[PDB]
A paper describes a structure:
The activated [name] dimer contains two distinct ligand-binding sites. Small-molecule agonists, including imiquimod, guanosine and 2’,3’-cGMP bind to site 1 in the dimerization interface and directly induce the formation of the activated [name] dimer, while uridine-containing ssRNAs bind to site 2 and allosterically enhance the binding affinity of site 1 ligands for TLR73,4.
Cpd-1, Cpd-2, Cpd-3 and other known [name] agonists induce a closed form structure which activates [name].
Residue numbers in the entry:
A (entry chain B), B (entry chain A): 27 to 42, 44 to 435, 459 to 475, 490 to 835
């Protein structure tokens, strides 16, 4: 199709509007490549090893609005140790001054010593994170008259130290009269720099050495919407980063009138400031405040009083997590009545308060919060909770009691990680959720869930339930749609397990391997028959190698995840009792039987598949052979994943195996060559992955053009391609085709002959084959 | 050193006595190789694809006493499906008759139709398992006059069916006057063949279709020691193989006088015979009986009566496992007083009796069994057990309550597998063991172990213990040497955990990842300080990524398994706080920190290692780089396992890194070449593994002969060796060296230059490099 092969090692995209995008992210480049389109508006060269920039770099590219040149020399401790950057990035005079339309420049992570000068006046965003610029002078900032967004953080901290205090000249930023966003985080800053331009909307001063706020420090910032002063005087108990507290167990000292000017303030973040009190006076003139983070302080006592809450009626989120007093295990949670002032509250989080017994009345300040959607009391070591108290919280979307010690989405490192916003180079949607995951529930019965019939999802993942569920345990949960019972010890003695959950759409019993791992125990896998609206069943990593029932049954079920089991043993050659195990799942469209140690499939496995099977995975089975003809049985098969196996051959003619098949994944196999007519007339095919095999040669007969050209994608990388004159057609095709083939720049490569070893096939001149 | 290179693709061993052993096991052979030593006494060709035997096969090898020719054509269902055997093995006339000294012939698993004829009269052992010989005639057996051991089983069963009954001519075996061992198992046999020669010591008739024993069937077998009639009229409940019971739930019918002749019988096996009664009269004339297997019958009631036990005073092992009545959960275990008759009993196993409550008095028949060493009551769904009852079983070596449901070594498939003796082509030694693994113990306290101070090992692996152990939980266990606490949920709030176990030598707290997987929880890894005689600590797969203590401490500890954790995060670059985590384990000699996601090691890791470290593993870390010089810090290092990483290079001179190092494992890395003087003067070295890398070339400078020749082993297989004239020395060396290098037959191989692709380097003629 194409007249001129795209030889540029960067993805090029159009958009009309009106952007020409050139993305060279992570292309192992040591120079800016030649032939970048002159119309280029956005050029990305992130993660490469380009050691300098000069006026030659961008000469012809006068229409550039954005250059993203991040991480071409990242600080030693932040980057790869196998390929360390030898020397900081060199920027030569007048490299940017030509770029009359340049609006964004990202130079993060280049070990720069200074704010690059000679930048053009059209620049709105400038990002210099993770460099070694730790002294800002007014003179260096004059070029930035029209600047709106300025990221200067991570220039002096434990991952990238500068060994002195940050320095900011008096009034350095003042004459930047258009500045809206300033970030000075992770910098060893000692005082709020002043005076700052009043135009500011967002100010980020977190993770620094600021011991005191002066009452002056935010006087003029009357358009400020986000202030973050977190991690100045951090609370260091169990901190997963090196943590130095302020002397004398002191807090970040904030004058009572410090926030008076900030009438527009929407978000205030005071996490890890070692605060013992929260003075009401702080919020006297802020009534627009919507988000407040008071996590990681010493506010356990203040939670019982909290007079400041009366001043916060528009507040949408409040976080008081990890305010526990060291070495104290409270009997209960004392929430102040003041919590009842929070008319607009949607999200309340009080993780890590740390108390033994939760009781209904203790949440009564929350009863009339009409908008409350989330109550998060995770990680509290709660031992006792009458779950029925939550009958008064029907309106809530999520009740999170995750990670507690009861017996009858945020980052996994969120509250403790250093900078949760650091730049690198789920059943809630079913309705009301009670999350009881990672608790100590060993026994359940009906009354445990009394008054909880409104519940739509229940998370019991990671408890100790080790019990012969007979259909009586969950009887009140008449509206339950999703049950996560993963990481328990389900005993399937009774096929009546779970049948009381008459509205159940999704059941996860993955990682309940305990009772499947011992010989001679009963397992009623036919339990699915009773669940009339069950759509999705996950029974992964259960080590299932024996079953009392010969057949699983459902009129409703569509997806079955059966990965990480032992069908190899169930379908032991010579034993045909279980070949029809899935056949009576009549509406089953998706089946995952990857990770089942299936070296081979006995005859009968395919015949025994249910008739509407569409998406089949046999990945990661160590499969050494595959009778491809047997795909004829699966009359609606559209996706076949045979990734990560040991197949050495493809079918002689794929269209004689399956007429329906559209997506064939054969990556990470041992295929050495294709059959002479492999894809001939396979008109249904649309996605083919042959990456990470050991193919040398592809001839036209195997890959007819009329099939190839309707492929949405065709993955060929990491093979063993021989670039002799026999390869003439393949090479030509690859160079001139519109079909998307990833990694041409990077890992579609000749291994031989001699001359062309290691050379990418996109770049290959084979003119000597026509001389 | 050697004058003539060993080119035969088989391991050759001498022994004086006086055997020349040639082992060609699994060498992908399609012919018997040439040049087998004429003095060969034992030739093994197991698992190859040799399609026939003829007089040429063994012509010169007249001194052969044993031919093992197993599995060169295994039945379709038993063998590989990627390389199925096309056609049964052909044996030609007179292939064996020359072999005048032949004493053993194994022809198992070759799809033979008939007992190969023309065998020599010196033959003592003949094995024809897993063939298709399912009709034995007196005439075919006349060659075997002097035969002593005859294995004919697995010729007709579900893994290798023959579709008819087995047939044995009347008196077929009678004139084999020297026969001692006859095995007719897994054969669809319908009656005990008669008359059998009285010389028999062992008779194997298990897994067949024998409905009745005639009172005659064992009349003359007065030297018989082992009889096994198991799995005739099997009990089929939860059988993991296809299982057809005798009609009317009938048992194997055994006349009361059937065993009268068997005065020498030592072992009787009646497993899976659907027995409802055990008539005393059976044992009237057998007082030598030492082993009795009555597992998989319907003997629940009989266990309460068991009059037959009075006739068995010399019995050493008894097995009554899996005799439960279907659908019954007994309240208790009724053991007959008759159990007190068993003066010689060492081992009693009553798995799968199935009862709720175990109580002291119920074991009183066992109190005066002076020799009892093992009581196995595993897999009983016991809910309640005062563990103090075992104060009356101090003399026992093992009390096994594994796989039960309690709250406040044999095969994993042993009792249920088809043929536990099918041929394929641990803290007990510390003293008294109480195995409580895989139970439902969620809470422990002191009194749980009252009167149990004699215990030396306790297995609590795989319970639900989820508790802040403070040093009070195990207080009675004053002599305990080994605690397996693996697969629980240890909460290390307190550093006093386990301190009451003052004699503890080994602690396994592996797979207690639950509390290490959540953020902001305390973990006192310094808990080891209190354990004064602790030798070995296993804390594998705990996902440990944070720690309250900066240092682990012990004066005693020698081995620490810390595999499968997140030292990568603990030793996050820039964070120095945990670089000395193991330093104060002063006597630590072995450390495993494989599987820790260590892409690189920060500086300080090696400095912070304790001073007597000898065996260090960094396997399976994805390590991309390694400063080898830093090995100088580990002054007593002897074993370094860097297997399964991404190292691309070896040290310039290994002796400049470590003077102590003896075993260096670099297998499964990405090493493309060795340094010019790699092993120069490394006189301490003894074992070097460079297998599975991508090395092309090794020159003499890298591998000096004076280092090489003290190596006990040197692994080079699965590399990318180029066999040009530059390789002349390497090839010569490999052909003529006495140093052990495994897999020279199989996987030490040229990939090029072209001619020699796929040719083994042992066989390589490079004379053209000297022309
Ligand atoms: C933050 O600034 C302080 C100075 O305020 C740095 O601390 C100095 O570091 C050197 C070498 O580490 C010491 O010898 C000085 O005495 C330190 N001075 C003080 C006052 O502590 C600190 O390292 C800087 N932080 C970072 C991460 O670069
Ligand atoms: C040794 C197997 C006994 C019969 O099978 C079997 N399988 C299980 N999963 C349970 N759970 C379980 O509690 N039992 C005990 C039982 C036995 C009979 C009647 C009721 C309860 C189990 N028995
Ligand atoms: C979430 C912050 C609580 C402090 O750390 C922490 N870590 C643990 N592993 C436990 N186990 C545990 O039971 N607690 C609660 C506790 C707290 C103080 C005193 C006694 C008991 C824990 N607290
Ligand atoms: C192109 O640059 C403009 C200005 O920086 C930006 O708003 C737009 O999102 C960019 N598009 C990219 C990187 O694809
Ligand atoms: C249940 O909680 C677990 C463990 O905290 C989490 O992995 C999982 O996402 C939750 N399941 C659902 C369906 O939300
Ligand atoms: C289920 O078990 C509960 C108690 O464990 C019992 O009340 C109920 O009757 C049982 N149901 C059936 C159908 O056996
Ligand atoms: C399930 O398993 C078997 C039949 O295969 C039978 O014992 C049991 O009653 C069946 N129950 C249900 C609900 O299908
Ligand atoms: C060699 O064969 C003899 C006779 O069958 C046997 O007893 C001996 O175990 C064999 N030895 C080895 C090492 O294979
Ligand atoms: C055992 O014999 C019966 C008839 O006697 C036959 O139908 C059956 O197939 C045989 N079994 C096998 C496994 O060959
Ligand atoms: C268990 O039995 C012992 C006798 O050895 C007795 O001292 C103890 O009180 C019993 N404990 C319980 C909890 O039943
Ligand atoms: C404890 O029991 C488990 C089986 O439940 C086993 O794998 C482990 O090796 C046993 N521990 C010891 C120390 O023997
Ligand atoms: C362990 O570490 C803590 C400090 O992190 C200390 O309080 C405690 O006493 C130490 N315990 C032992 C047994 O060393
Ligand atoms: C080193 O450790 C491994 C197990 O971790 C062991 O198999 C090996 O024998 C040890 N080496 C020596 C020389 O003791
Ligand atoms: C390494 O070699 C150099 C030069 O031979 C020597 O000076 C140095 O001390 C050596 N280091 C060790 C650890 O042997």
């Amino acid at each position: 199709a194409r007249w001129f092969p795209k030889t540029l090692p960067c993805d090029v995209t159009l958009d009309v509007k009106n952007h020409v995008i050139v993305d060279c992210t992570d292309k192992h480049l040591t120079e800016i490549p030649g032939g970048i389109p002159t119309n280029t508006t956005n050029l990305t060269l992130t993660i490469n090893h380009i050691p300098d920039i000069s006026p030659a770099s961008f000469h012809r590219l006068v229409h550039l609005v954005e250059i993203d040149f991040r991480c071409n020399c990242v600080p030693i401790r932040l980057g790869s140790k196998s390929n360390m950057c030898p020397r900081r990035l060199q920027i030569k005079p007048r490299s940017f001054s030509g770029l009359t339309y340049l609006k964004s420049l990202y130079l993060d992570g280049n070990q720069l010593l200074e704010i690059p000068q000679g930048l053009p006046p059209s620049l709105q965003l400038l990002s210099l994170e993770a460099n070694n610029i730790f002294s800002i002078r007014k003179e260096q900032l004059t070029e930035l008259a029209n600047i709106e967004i300025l990221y200067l953080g991570q220039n002096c901290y434990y991952r990238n130290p500068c060994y002195v205090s940050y320095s900011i000249e008096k009034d350095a930023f003042l004459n930047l009269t258009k500045l809206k966003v300033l970030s000075l985080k992770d910098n060893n800053v000692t005082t709020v720099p002043t005076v700052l331009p009043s135009t500011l909307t967002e100010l980020y001063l977190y993770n620094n050495m600021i011991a005191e706020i002066q009452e002056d420090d935010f006087n003029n910032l009357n358009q400020l919407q986000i202030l973050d002063l977190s991690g100045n005087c951090p609370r260091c108990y169990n901190a997963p980063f090196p943590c130095t507290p302020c002397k004398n167990n002191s807090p970040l000292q904030i004058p009572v009138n410090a926030f008076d000017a900030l009438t527009e303030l929407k978000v205030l973040r005071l996490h890890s400031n070692s605060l013992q009190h929260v003075p009401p006076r702080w919020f006297k003139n802020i009534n627009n405040l919507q988000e407040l983070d008071l996590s990681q302080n010493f506010l356990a006592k203040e939670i019982g009083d909290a007079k400041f809450l009366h001043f916060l009626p528009n507040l949408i989120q409040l976080d008081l997590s990890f305010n526990f007093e060291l070495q104290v295990y409270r009997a209960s949670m004392n929430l102040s009545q003041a919590f009842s002032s929070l008319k607009s509250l949607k999200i309340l989080r009080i993780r890590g308060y740390v108390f033994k017994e939760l009781k209904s009345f203790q949440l009564s300040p929350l009863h009339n919060l009409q908008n409350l959607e989330v109550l998060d009391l995770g990680t509290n070591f709660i031992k006792i909770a009458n779950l029925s108290m939550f009958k008064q919280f029907k309106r809530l979307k999520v009740i999170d009691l995750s990670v507690n010690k009861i017996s009858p989405v945020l980052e996994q490192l969120y509250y403790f990680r250093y900078d949760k916003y650091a730049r690198s180079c789920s059943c809630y949607k079913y309705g009301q959720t009670l999350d009881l995951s990672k608790n100590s529930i060993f026994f359940i019965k009906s009354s445990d869930f009394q008054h909880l019939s409104f519940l739509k999802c229940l998370n019991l993942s990671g408890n100790l339930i080790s019990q012969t569920l007979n259909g009586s345990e969950f009887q009140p949960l008449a509206e339950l749609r999703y049950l996560d019972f993963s990481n328990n010890r389900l005993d399937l003695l009774h096929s009546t397990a779970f049948e009381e959950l008459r509205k159940l759409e999704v059941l996860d019993i993955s990682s309940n391997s305990h009772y499947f791992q011992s010989e001679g125990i009963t397992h009623m896998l036919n339990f699915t028959k009773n669940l009339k609206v069950l759509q999705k069943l996950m029974m992964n990593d259960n080590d299932i190698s024996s079953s009392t029932s010969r057949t699983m049954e459902s009129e409703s079920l569509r997806t079955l995840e059966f990965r990480g089991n032992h069908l190899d043993v169930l379908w032991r050659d010579g034993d045909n009792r279980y070949l029809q195990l899935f056949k009576n799942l009549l509406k089953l469209e998706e089946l995952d039987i990857s990770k089942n140690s299936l070296s081979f499939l006995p005859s009968g496995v395919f015949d025994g598949m249910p008739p509407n099977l569409k998406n089949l995975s046999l990945a990661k089975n160590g499969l050494k052979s595959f009778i491809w003809e047997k795909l004829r049985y699966l009359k609606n098969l559209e996706t076949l994943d045979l990734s990560h196996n040991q197949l050495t051959t493809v079918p002689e003619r794929l269209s004689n195996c399956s007429r329906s098949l559209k997506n064939l994944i054969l990556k990470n196999n041992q295929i050495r060559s294709l059959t002479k007519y492999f894809l001939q007339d396979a008109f249904q095919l649309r996605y083919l992955d042959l990456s990470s095999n050991k193919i040398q040669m592809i001839q036209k007969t195997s890959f007819p053009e009329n099939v190839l050209n309707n492929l949405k994608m065709l993955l060929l990388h990491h093979n063993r391609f021989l670039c002799t004159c026999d390869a003439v057609w393949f090479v030509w095709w690859v160079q001139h085709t519109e079909v998307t083939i990833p990694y041409l720049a990077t890992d579609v490569t000749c291994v031989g002959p001699g001359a062309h070893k290691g050379q990418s096939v996109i770049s290959l001149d084979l003119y000597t084959c026509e001389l």
